[PDB]
From a paper:
The IE gene product, infected cell protein 4 (ICP4) is a transcriptional regulator with a prominent role within this cascade. ICP4 can induce the expression of E and L genes, while conversely it can act as a repressor notably of itself and also other IE genes. ICP4 homo-dimerization is mediated by the DBD, this region interacts preferentially with a bi-partite and asymmetric DNA consensus sequence RTCGTCnnYnYSG (where R is a purine, Y is a pyrimidine, S is a C or G and n is any base). Here we present the crystal structure of the functionally essential ICP4 DNA binding domain in complex with a segment from its own promoter, revealing a novel homo-dimeric fold.
The combination of the ICP4 DBD, residues 258–487 (ICP4N) with a 19mer DNA duplex matching the consensus site from the ICP4 promoter (IE3_19mer), resulted in the formation of a stoichiometric complex, which can be readily separated by gel filtration. The most complete molecular assembly was present in the ICP4N·IE3_19mer data and comprised protein chains C, D and J with DNA chains G and H which were chosen as the reference ICP4 DBD structure unless stated otherwise. Superposition of chains C and D, which together form a homo-dimer from the same molecular assembly indicated that the individual ICP4N polypeptide chains adopt the same overall fold with a backbone RMSD of 1.15 Å for aa301–484. The crystal structure data indicated that the globular region of the ICP4N homo-dimer contacts the upstream base pairs 1–13 of the IE3_19mer DNA duplex. The IE3_19mer DNA is bound across one edge of the ICP4N dimer interface and the upstream region is partially enveloped by complementary structural features of the protein. The protein residues which contact the DNA are mainly clustered within two regions in both protein chains: first the S-loop (aa411–431) and second the short loop connecting helix α6 to α7, which contains an arginine pair (R456, R457) and therefore we have called aa454–459 the ‘R-turn’. The S-loop forms intermolecular contacts with the R-turn of their dimeric partner; the same loops of different monomers adopt a different conformation depending on their location within the major or minor DNA groove. A dipeptide of F283-T284 (chain J) was also observed in contact with the DNA, notably the aromatic sidechain of F283 intercalates within a kink between base-pairs 14 and 15, where the minor groove width is widened between the bases correspond to YS in the consensus sequence. Therefore these data were indicative of a link between DNA within the YnYSG downstream segment and aa258–289 of ICP4, a predicted IDR. Away from the globular domain, with the exception of a DNA intercalating dipeptide F283 and T284, residues 258–286 were absent from the electron density; this region was shown by solution NMR data to be intrinsically disordered, but involved in DNA binding.
Numbering used by the authors:
A (entry chain C): 292 to 486
B (entry chain D): 289 to 485
Amino acid sequence: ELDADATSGAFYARYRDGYVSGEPWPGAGPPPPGRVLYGGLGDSRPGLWGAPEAEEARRRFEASGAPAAVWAPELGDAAQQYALITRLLYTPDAEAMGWLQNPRVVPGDVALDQACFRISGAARNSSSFITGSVARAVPHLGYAMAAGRFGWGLAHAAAAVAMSRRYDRAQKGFLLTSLRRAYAPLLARENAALT
Amino acid sequence: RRVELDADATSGAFYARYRDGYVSGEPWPGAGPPPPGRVLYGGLGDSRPGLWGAPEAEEARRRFEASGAPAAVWAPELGDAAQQYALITRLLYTPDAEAMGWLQNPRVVPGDVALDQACFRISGAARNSSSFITGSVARAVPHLGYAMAAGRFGWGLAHAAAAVAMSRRYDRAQKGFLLTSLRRAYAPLLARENAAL
DNA sequence: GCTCCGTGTGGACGATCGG
DNA sequence: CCGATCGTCCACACGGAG
Ligand SMILES: [Cl-]
Ligand SMILES: [Mg+2]
């Protein structure tokens, strides 16, 4: 169906949901002890704390001041990576969409990524596995779902567009501007309430 | 490059001051209507000849016009892109509609196949691999160039939600969370954009 | 006239899933 | 048989130097 209540815009101005920002999404929570979020909702993989791959990447992440090209929960708090990627999506000339799809990766970034899916249970990286993040730089969606932070959905939506092969460079730039306009008031209102 | 976090962005005040140099309702830089007798197709500025007279286009147009629902496989020959955008946008806000599942796994009838094959034949034969730019990640969603030509950023919701729906990295509950995130973000934008235009 | 660089695009082909 | 995403590799433009 389609009414004049929709084409005029009044149906969207009255949008309300039963969820509360800052409250856990139904079924979402922290991973079991000694494990980190991975895969589908509620799933997890063993952590790689003390492993050479995780610790080498943790030091590089803490020393760069930039968002990590390959992120894992062993590297730090997901809120830091979410905020760095979110800010990156709003800085002009940053090439955020190109960086989300094809970031420059040192061998340590490759070794970290290979260790995470291997310790989960995978023999090789495969396009069919549900990981909870379409781009390796974006933290697992379960951390946004557990914290009830809908503004962290922007990182995943922008990365899903960036990772798609069906849009060219100029088309992705328009979609990034669309997402900037949509999420800017949400992020401003959400970051104020939870600070 | 490098990103500097600070209290201006952590408190949210950097996002409250967001402004861009674009104007809603005005063409995106480099974007415009297709040439006469052609429809938008492929990358930015590209186009293919229209099929407004072919039997495949007319069969699908009647099915679209007789259902009152958005077409599962859409082409410019079926009607106004703005109407299909509005139907998909309304569908994305409809409870119990299974919108993400429908975007990812639509029913494709023989008439849809004949329409889709007629569109690629009237263009050039580029396919020899699976990597090709279409301008829309889901066939039900009109070409992005129509949103770019009209400067309608609210029509980006249909493409952003469809890109999530087609991704293989999220399960059903994760895609449901992302739809709610996109609903909240775009609801004030759509309300404000539909009023001005 | 060839290469040499880094870097930024899209294509090619396969793995895996599924109608 | 068809085709979807996405890992992985690669083709090519960029241009002042030899
Ligand atoms: Cl709320
Ligand atoms: Mg066949």
